[PDB]
């Protein structure tokens, strides 16, 4: 990753080069031949960690390169906030240019002879299946028959990513299987495991939460809310080691009611152990010579739809796909990476004997997926090698989300935005041109299609592991980290803490609370190049207002992100001198009474957000006056003078996402409804009314047009009878997206079906738990031509339509 | 004194957030927070006829902050501390209460006061307040009317939210008794559940609730209490006295005369088809008792068959 931290500092030098608040000095000109000379690093920096192996001599020159990129940042942005006299920064860095003369000479003596990837704009989801009919069917009607012994357990054995969950998970979400049992359950049990969040993470799905007592209590709510039900239970990826806890359980739960249980593990000698009679064992299937090379025409073009159109490339594309031996992920993790190149036969054949040298040692079979994920990564763009490296500190097989890493991955200068293009735009196509190569697997998605939480495969993240331990990013069990993170209830380790530390993200399993100290949390304002101080999900012993008093020494932050923390009222007093924080994070923190009036000075900001803080008085005055930021989430404009109003939300051309909180009739003023028309930019508004009070609350949403240009909408409760009369087809053309949840809505005005020969181009509408719609379902497809999606979940009153039972649960209604 | 405060506060919104992440994976509706000088000025200290019923744990209170008016719940000291085991149903219940609030039949939590030990709930002014033990609110005068068709909205208007209960989310939960003590009004009639804190043979199943709401549903149409007795002992069953006037009275005991003017064309026919609802709904065959899901059907099915 030195051509990744090479290619930040580039842009970093670009941005203050050109900026012009130091026109001619002194550590100027020995500024541009650091550019100069680390542009002609970049013609051979890509095959430099191509060859960090086998070469130690080349990988020690190759780490002071990279260790010395720092002390050019960390003096740098040092030297850009500063506007003084320090004549103590330009003879270091005279050093640390002219030391780089012998970090590159030794390196020139051993090879001897942008940031942007035009392959990410389109996003694929590449998550076809193919080859399984009949090994899906035949253990299918083994759990037809889960009735015939008092237990059933499936056992399923197979190397490393040889394709076990995936066909798991066809079986455990199919519908005439859904039909028998009547609750299932999926756990992920691996080495770190706990013993007890096993059962909390089951009983997650049964009803209760796990209070922390004995293991007797813990088995009664089990007992009791599968007393002799049909159920399911898929523990998954189960070790050996301290196996023990499979006998405390599988001598508690009841038989002789059917169902089954789903055991996916990897090595033989545990199966017998497993005790499943091993005929009712099942070893996947490598996959045939032909399937194999039609998953990779599925996955590698995806343009064609799987098509070879280009006879050129077909001899080697059989010929790579018969190097990798029809194992699945090999074979999806090259074809990932042969979309994003497609044309050019060189360039095929380069990357094809790269994939033959690299391999030519194994003697293993693991060699094989951890050299072709190590081709993966090695041929990866630049900028994008951080960001999956920054995904290792994320513990085993946890379940991401999405904004968690976007906000890091601006936080670091790890993404690029330089003409237009948003930097919340840019920061997720970086996340699509990763689920293109297969690197990163989405598990959750919205109607809309966009995603909220992500995750990776199991053997992916030992490779990513190894590539950072190796680098100095991660390893917190240790002392040389670039970036640190703390995960669950890590207090006791008290990490020491220095000078490096570029960030501090909290990793919690979705229901866990890493709880902290006021020992170390003082700590973190001791460091003094921090940038990414995201400490999510926390229990305090102080509250942050004196805990965090010491951010007058840091001056390097991009983002903090305080969600989810329990003991905060204020934000600190010395935030006022801050000067970059590129974004101040604090949704769902429902308790702190006061935003501090010190975000109306630093204009650099692009997103705030906070949504749902439930007691917040108004967002200080001066929110005009920050040009530049992008989400603003979460508004509750004021009353008369305590705050601002949406007059000031008018100046903001760059925002394109926008939430309101609108609680009073009296918050929008009258004469200023002309304020959301000329936002040019705007692409998702939300209204969240939850608390409602007035009736002329309903008479000032009305009057309020969104923009012509609107993507998306979503209204949360809104309590008003009928529609708001901006809902029709001619006030916002190109609404793509539609959801309403809650609330008092009763039926749709006469525009709102808009019955001229135009029409609405919605693709996806949202229905969820209102209670008095009445519409039709053949008005609907009149009026709205290509719907895709009707995701109605809770909605009586609306038997029209061809949902199952639309009033009591939801569905989805895919177009035909 | 004030140190007393703060120490409070620490420990009751570590244990609230530490509930509420493990419930809801840190996502919620919006809690605002009050100062405990808002409510001990908006009801005079507990200290008035502001009270509207009360129970073992709780007791709920009419509260006023400026131009706007709430029902406070407070939840009492002494009968608590000392069971951990109550403790934590005391933080289930103000969890599940704000899980709850985004469907309509659940009354909305719109914020929680927790300076003081046992935090204090706070909830909408339905102005109708608990419905009494035979059904109607009590007046801001002295009685209720309850015309027929505002008595069947209000019965299938708990199915459809036990069911919310039952299959909405991934997980089920056991709402241990249905009682119309836990239903409140808002100004259209419509039925707001509440005060969910139980939410846990000696083992509950669903069928318990049916087996409760069975007995909920005929309370409300015949008016007379649930535990049914003149000058006989002063306990015996309403529900077997239910089953002796089907099987010899013969459907003209049920309806109360305070509900005696309706007589309009048929009107008992739906009447009929919603007591014999109830008789199944209470069958102590727990495999031939109705599932949940579809009793809110059937009253659905008999509302709209006029
Ligand atoms: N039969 C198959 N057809 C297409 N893709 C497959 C098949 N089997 C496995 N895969 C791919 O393998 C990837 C992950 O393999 P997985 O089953 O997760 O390995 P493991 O079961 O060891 O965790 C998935 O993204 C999936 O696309």
Same mark, same amino acid.
């Given at each position: ?252 739960? *009841? ?33 045939? *010579? ?74 293993? =079979? ?110 917190? =069990? ?61 229990? %305090? ?29 204020? %934000? ?57 930021? =992008?989400?603003?989430?979460? %508004? ?159 909605? *009586? ?10 009033? %009591? ?8 | ?154 019965? #299938? ?34 039925? #707001? ?56 009275? #013969? ?39 109705? #599932? ?15």
């Amino acid at each position: 990753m030195v051509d990744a931290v090479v290619t930040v500092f580039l842009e970093k030098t670009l941005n203050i080069l050109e900026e012009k608040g130091r026109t001619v000095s002194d550590y100027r000109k020995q500024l541009e031949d650091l550019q100069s000379e680390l542009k002609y690093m970049q013609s051979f920096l890509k095959d430099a960690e191509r060859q960090k192996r086998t070469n130690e001599t080349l990988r020690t020159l190759v780490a002071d390169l990279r260790e010395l990129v720092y002390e050019a940042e960390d003096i740098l942005v040092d030297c850009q906030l500063a506007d003084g006299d320090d004549g103590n920064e330009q003879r270091s860095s005279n050093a640390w240019l002219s030391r780089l003369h012998p970090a590159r000479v030794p390196l020139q003596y051993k090879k001897s002879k942008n940031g942007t990837d035009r392959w990410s704009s389109p996003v694929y989801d590449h998550t076809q299946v193919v080859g399984l009919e009949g090994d899906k069917r035949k253990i299918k009607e083994w759990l037809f028959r889960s009735n015939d012994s008092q237990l059933l357990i499936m056992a399923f054995v197979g190397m490393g990513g040889l394709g076990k969950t995936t066909i798991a998970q066809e079986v455990f979400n199919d519908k005439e299987i859904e039909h028998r049992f009547e609750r299932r359950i999926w756990v992920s049990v691996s080495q770190t495991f706990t013993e007890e969040q096993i059962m909390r993470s089951i009983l997650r799905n049964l009803g209760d939460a796990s209070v922390g007592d004995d293991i007797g209590t813990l088995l009664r709510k089990i007992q009791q809310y599968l007393l002799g039900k049909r159920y399911l239970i898929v523990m998954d990826d189960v070790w050996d080691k301290n196996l023990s806890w499979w006998d405390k359980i599988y001598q508690g739960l *009841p038989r002789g009611q059917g169902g089954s249980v789903i055991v996916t593990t990897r090595s033989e000698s545990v199966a017998k152990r497993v005790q499943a009679r091993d005929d009712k064992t099942h070893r996947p299937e490598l996959l045939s *010579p032909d399937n194999s090379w039609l998953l990779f025409c599925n996955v590698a073009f995806a343009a064609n739809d799987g098509t070879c159109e280009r006879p050129e490339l077909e001899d080697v594309g059989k010929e790579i796909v018969t190097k990798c031996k029809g194992l699945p992920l090999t074979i999806k993790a090259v074809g990932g990476l042969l979309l994003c190149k497609d044309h050019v036969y060189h360039e095929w054949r380069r990357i094809a004997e790269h994939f033959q040298d690299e391999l030519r040692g194994n003697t293993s =079979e693991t060699d094989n997926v951890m050299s072709s994920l190590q081709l993966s990564y090695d041929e990866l763009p630049s900028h994008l090698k951080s960001c999956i490296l920054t995904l290792s500190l994320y513990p085993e097989d946890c379940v991401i989300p999405k904004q968690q890493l976007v906000h890091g991955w601006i936080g670091e200068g790890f993404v690029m935005w330089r003409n237009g293009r948003s930097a919340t735009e840019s920061g997720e196509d970086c996340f699509s041109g990763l689920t293109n190569r297969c690197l990163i697997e989405v598990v959750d998605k919205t109607y809309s299609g966009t995603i909220i939480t992500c995750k990776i495969h199991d053997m992916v993240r030992d490779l990513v592991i190894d590539i950072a331990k190796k680098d100095s990013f991660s390893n917190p =069990e240790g002392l040389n980290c670039r970036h640190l993170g703390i995960s669950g209830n890590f207090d006791e380790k008290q990490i020491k803490v220095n000078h490096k530390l570029r960030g501090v993200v909290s990793t919690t399993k979705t229901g866990e609370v890493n709880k902290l100290n006021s020992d170390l949390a003082k700590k973190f304002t001791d460091c003094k190049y921090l940038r990414v101080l995201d400490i999510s999900k926390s229990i %305090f012993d102080a509250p942050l207002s004196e805990i965090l008093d010491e951010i007058a020494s840091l001056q390097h932050l991009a983002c903090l992100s305080l969600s989810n923390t329990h003991p905060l009222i204020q %934000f600190p007093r010395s935030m006022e001198d801050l000067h970059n924080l590129q974004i101040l994070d604090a949704s769902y923190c429902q308790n702190l009474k006061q935003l501090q009036p010190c975000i109306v000075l630093f204009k650099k900001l692009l997103v705030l957000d906070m949504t749902n803080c439930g007691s917040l008085e108004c967002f200080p005055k001066g929110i005009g006056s920050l040009v530049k930021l =992008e989400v603003l989430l979460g %508004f509750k404009p004021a009353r008369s003078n305590n705050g601002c109003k949406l007059s000031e939300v008018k100046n903001l051309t760059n925002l394109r996402k926008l939430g309101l909180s609108l609680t009073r009739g009296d918050q929008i003023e009258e004469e200023e409804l002309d304020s959301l028309i000329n936002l040019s930019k705007l692409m998702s508004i939300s209204i969240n009314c939850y608390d409602s009070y007035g009736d002329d609350l309903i008479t000032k949403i009305d009057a309020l047009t969104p923009p012509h240009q609107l993507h998306e909408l979503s209204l949360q409760f809104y309590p008003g009878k009928s529609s708001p009369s901006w809902l029709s087809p001619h006030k916002l053309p190109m609404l793509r997206y539609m959801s309403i949840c809650s609330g008092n809505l009763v039926k749709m005005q006469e525009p709102f079906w808009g019955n001229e020969n135009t029409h609405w181009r919605i693709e996806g509408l949202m229905l969820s738990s209102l209670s008095d719609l009445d519409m039709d379902w053949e008005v609907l497809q009149q009026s709205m031509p290509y719907l895709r999606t009707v995701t109605a979940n809770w909605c *009586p009153e609306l038997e029209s339509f061809a949902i199952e039972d639309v009033g %009591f649960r939801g569905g989805v209604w895919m177009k035909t | 004194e004030k140190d007393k405060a703060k120490r409070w506060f620490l420990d009751n919104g570590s244990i609230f957030l530490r509930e509420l992440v493990a419930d809801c994976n840190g996502k919620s509706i919006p809690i605002r927070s009050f100062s405990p000088e808002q409510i001990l000025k908006a009801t005079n200290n507990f200290d008035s006829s502001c009270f509207v019923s009360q129970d073992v744990y709780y007791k709920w209170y009419r509260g006023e902050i400026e131009d706007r008016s709430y029902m406070i719940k407070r939840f009492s000291e002494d009968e608590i501390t000392g069971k951990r085991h109550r403790v934590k149903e005391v933080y289930n219940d103000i969890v599940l209460s704000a899980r709850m609030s985004n469907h309509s039949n659940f009354l909305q939590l719109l914020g929680c006061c927790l300076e003081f030990p046992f935090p204090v709930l706070v909830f909408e002014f339905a102005e109708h307040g608990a419905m009494n033990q035979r059904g109607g609110v009590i007046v801001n005068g002295e009685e209720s009317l309850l015309p027929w068709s505002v008595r069947l909205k209000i019965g #299938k208007e708990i199915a459809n939210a036990v069911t919310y209960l039952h299959t909405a989310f991934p997980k089920i939960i056991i709402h241990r008794d249905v009682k119309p003590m836990h239903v409140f009004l808002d100004k259209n009639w419509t039925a #707001k559940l509440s005060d969910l804190s139980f939410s846990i043979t000696c083992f509950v199943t669903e069928y318990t609730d049916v087996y409760s709401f069975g007995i909920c549903l005929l309370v409300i149409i015949t008016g007379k209490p649930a535990i049914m007795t003149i000058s006989d002992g002063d306990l015996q069953g309403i529900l077997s006295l239910v089953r002796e006037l089907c099987e010899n009275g #013969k459907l003209d005991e049920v309806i109360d005369p305070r509900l005696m003017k309706d007589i309009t064309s048929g009107q008992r026919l739906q009447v009929e088809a919603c007591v014999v609802l109830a008789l199944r709904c209470c069958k102590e065959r727990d495999e031939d008792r109705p #599932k949940m899901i579809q009793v809110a059907k059937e009253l659905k099915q008999i509302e709209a068959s006029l």
